[PDB]
Design a protein around this ligand. Sequence first.
Ligand SMILES: [Mg+2]
Ligand SMILES: [Mg+2]
Ligand SMILES: [Mg+2]
Ligand SMILES: [Mg+2]
Ligand SMILES: [Mg+2]
Ligand SMILES: [Mg+2]
Ligand SMILES: [Mg+2]
Ligand SMILES: [Mg+2]
Lengths: 243, 242, 243, 243
Amino acid sequence: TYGGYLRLDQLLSAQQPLSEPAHHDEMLFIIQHQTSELWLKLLAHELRAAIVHLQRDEVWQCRKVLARSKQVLRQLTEQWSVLETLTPSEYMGFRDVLGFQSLQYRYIEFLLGNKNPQMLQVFAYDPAGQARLREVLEAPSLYEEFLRYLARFGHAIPQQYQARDWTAAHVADDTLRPVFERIYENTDRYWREYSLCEDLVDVETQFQLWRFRHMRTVMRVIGFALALTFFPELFDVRTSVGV
Amino acid sequence: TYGGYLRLDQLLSAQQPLSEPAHHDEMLFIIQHQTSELWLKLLAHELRAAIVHLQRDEVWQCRKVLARSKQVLRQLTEQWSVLETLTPSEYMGFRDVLGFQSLQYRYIEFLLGNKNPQMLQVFAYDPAGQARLREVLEAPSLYEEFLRYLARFGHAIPQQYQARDWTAAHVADDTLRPVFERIYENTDRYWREYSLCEDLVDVETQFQLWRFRHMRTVMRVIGFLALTFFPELFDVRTSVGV
Amino acid sequence: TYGGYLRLDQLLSAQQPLSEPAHHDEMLFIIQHQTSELWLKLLAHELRAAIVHLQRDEVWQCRKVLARSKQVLRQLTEQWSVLETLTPSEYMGFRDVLGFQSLQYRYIEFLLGNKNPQMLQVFAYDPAGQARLREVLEAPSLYEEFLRYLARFGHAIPQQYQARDWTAAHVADDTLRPVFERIYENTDRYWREYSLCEDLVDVETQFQLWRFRHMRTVMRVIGFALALTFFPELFDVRTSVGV
Amino acid sequence: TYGGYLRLDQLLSAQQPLSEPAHHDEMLFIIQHQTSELWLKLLAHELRAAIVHLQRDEVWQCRKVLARSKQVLRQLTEQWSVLETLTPSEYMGFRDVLGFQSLQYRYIEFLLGNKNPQMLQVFAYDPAGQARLREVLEAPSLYEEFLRYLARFGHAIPQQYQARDWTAAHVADDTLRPVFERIYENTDRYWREYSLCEDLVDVETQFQLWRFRHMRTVMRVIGFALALTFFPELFDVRTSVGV
Ligand SMILES: [Mg+2]
Ligand SMILES: [Mg+2]
Ligand SMILES: [Mg+2]
Ligand SMILES: [Mg+2]
Ligand SMILES: [Mg+2]
Ligand SMILES: [Mg+2]
Ligand SMILES: [Mg+2]
Ligand SMILES: [Mg+2]
């Protein structure tokens, strides 16, 4: 049965609004958070595949899970259009019963390299999950594996990337500029690398839009935009390409 | 708690892939349909509110929930953009599944008006869900509660819409044509009706688009649209030059 | 004739890339600015209708020119997805031939209330446009007409808004809080006002989204922001409504 | 200068309403079709390149231009969202225009292979334009230059694709079935062909949505076959690829 394979009775019975007279607009609020959380589960799943592909020098496949990841990210961004229909007037009606962090979101941020050892606490409330979270904190990021990939093929990548303490969020590296300069200037020769650099900018960019949208919705519903970056050098290089 | 208010342990434990050496793209298949089903649940919730508001002549309240419905419908449509990344080569790896309806989906169509009693039988199981169909099947459609709305305000609505066998899917009626003709050719006096009409044309189009996408996505994955909910609404376009 | 009514010969004859050996990616770059510029012309047109409607107290007409404005604004936003495909490497090719402000953009910004008397002189060259621009600079904004509208129907709008120097950009006014506070608190009595507030929030939000996309594309293309606001009190009210 | 590079004086003087009295909604009608027309111009420009790259066996390159091409087709589709705000009430106001086809639209159907000689004598007016149509009418389609790409790398391709009357619209070839069957059934070896296959299914699908959309907006504005298919066996193989 369609309902049986997708476990719809379980899925469709996870919505328990807790407002006194059952406010009409509470449902939107729940669903919206639930669809998002499910997409976060798909994202992590694909992204994990990409890291393995890179590790095994499998470009097209890894490129074939990053393409999907972008689509999913574009969805996490599109969904805000519906929550935008929630007005302050409607929110007053059930906001009361509320008082909010996502272990899946943090997982995704850890995966892209934005690591923060302090984040492990506040989550050891789920050891099994905190364990999955710790595993990522201790291993290279998507960006770092990309770099470990470049070194495996003749690109001047600083030795410290072969092995260091991965638990510290990567720091912008000047010595990386020329590596990315050479790639963009010779595209015929470095087409594989070139394609991957662009896929990564897409991923970090679609991701920024998602965070920005998120903040505008919070403004219009609850009222009173960071500048963090995942791939510094890929963005910095823009100012020097074409020496 | 975040995870407690949303029931995340239950939600995120509803993904049961079943491949014997387990397949990678299977997960996409699942969560694709589950988020879709989740929006359908939110869509019905709003659509019902639209009917109640319509019965009370609460025009602005009604027009609104429809606005949200339009937005939800747009999401159901835009959403196929990720399933389209599933290739026949990938699908082979787990195609050994079934061959696939959707009670929730059917509920919305009944609600809009495409009534079909023969459907109640494809869900011989879980009579609670089957009971939901029957209950909405006997009530007037979203479109029909609109015609009764118009009757309450002096428009030439045929008597039969006051009471009849709601089980039978609406049938296009030529006698409505002049009613919508007066509305579109005098938009200032009838702005409320005018706006609701356009709201309805939006909901059908968006829905139509969604069905079209669904079919095109099926074409590329598995390999080898005349229904119309509000006929008179689309028909009048042809003669609104009176 | 389809081609003659739209004046397509004139239209498809306005693309003159000046890259030395005709660089393949210049075309995207030009039409991109052009479609954007055509949408900006439609926007100003509708927005102008909106001002008139509000002055004449015609709510639903106002509303339904504002509904289209949102769509056009969403178009200016979506459009960036195509320019994002322009890579630094492709940009290098014709980068060196171009050496960039829109009079229609500033017109749109003036309309919404972000008035800046200094802009005038930067357009001393097409006195015709400068004059169009001055007309707007001197008249109340879309937002200001909205407030003047509320004053016409029993809302405690400060007397000063009946007449003053519209040359200065609107300044956040805290005496406006209780006015917008009361609206959101009895949706039933103020449904008209309630809807316009939300249409206005939509317009500023969609507009912010557009400015953000713009900036992210500049980053991925040229590399190395402003949190202005058009309707302050409509956004500030979020924090008090209901307490 | 900005307005000089883009030729805005010409671009923004290409809107000639014909209403007397001037009708508010005529503008939307015009800019809607002109912006659409500009994108088509960029769409052709990229497609022609995709062909040349395909001729040169330059896979990644033919492929990038196709990605941008997909983005442009998406814009053409998403774009009807603003014309849907045009209502029968408004349309009556200027309806008196004419009973209405795009030379460029046909140029692109031809490029994709849906060729038709009777479709020439209908642009009976600027020969130079119908000339652009013929030049492509007798040239292989994007799909056919693809089939020839496949022939060069050892794929069982019928001889006729080597040379024939290109003026005729492709006819679904059953002997192509086992060819695509092998590519899909062994993606690692044929990753490039596998990629190009999928890229084509995207272009056709996005185009299908664009056509469906157009028809739906026509339905809601004016009043009362879309069974064409550019790459048939590509869609047909889906039903037989079974290990
Ligand atoms: Mg299962
Ligand atoms: Mg529940
Ligand atoms: Mg819940
Ligand atoms: Mg399951
Ligand atoms: Mg496919
Ligand atoms: Mg003309
Ligand atoms: Mg030019
Ligand atoms: Mg400017």
